[PDB]
Amino acid sequence: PSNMSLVKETVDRLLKGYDIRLRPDFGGPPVAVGMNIDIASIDMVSEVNMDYTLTMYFQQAWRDKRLSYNVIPLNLTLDNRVADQLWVPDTYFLNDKKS
């Protein structure tokens, strides 16, 4: 149970005093957001609507020093809802019509 309590303390410390409004290194150098795509399907390429439906595992990684922990030697994969509490890139697809 030591690891569970330590991880809870670490995540609570990370999320406490965190400002979602400011990007990493705000007022500083730009944050490098690397991107990775794993296309799972291209459902249909329609000429009538001049569009194609594409399904993918759109992944992106970036460095945020506010979310840096070193007490535990493992990678913490959290609930998806924590994404609503962390800054994420405002990525958008200029082509998408309905997504």
Partner: peptide, 16 residues
Amino acid sequence: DNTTVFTRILDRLLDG
């Protein structure tokens, strides 16, 4: 600490 200044700026803006 570096981002705390802009956090205080935003908090002052939205205050009241």
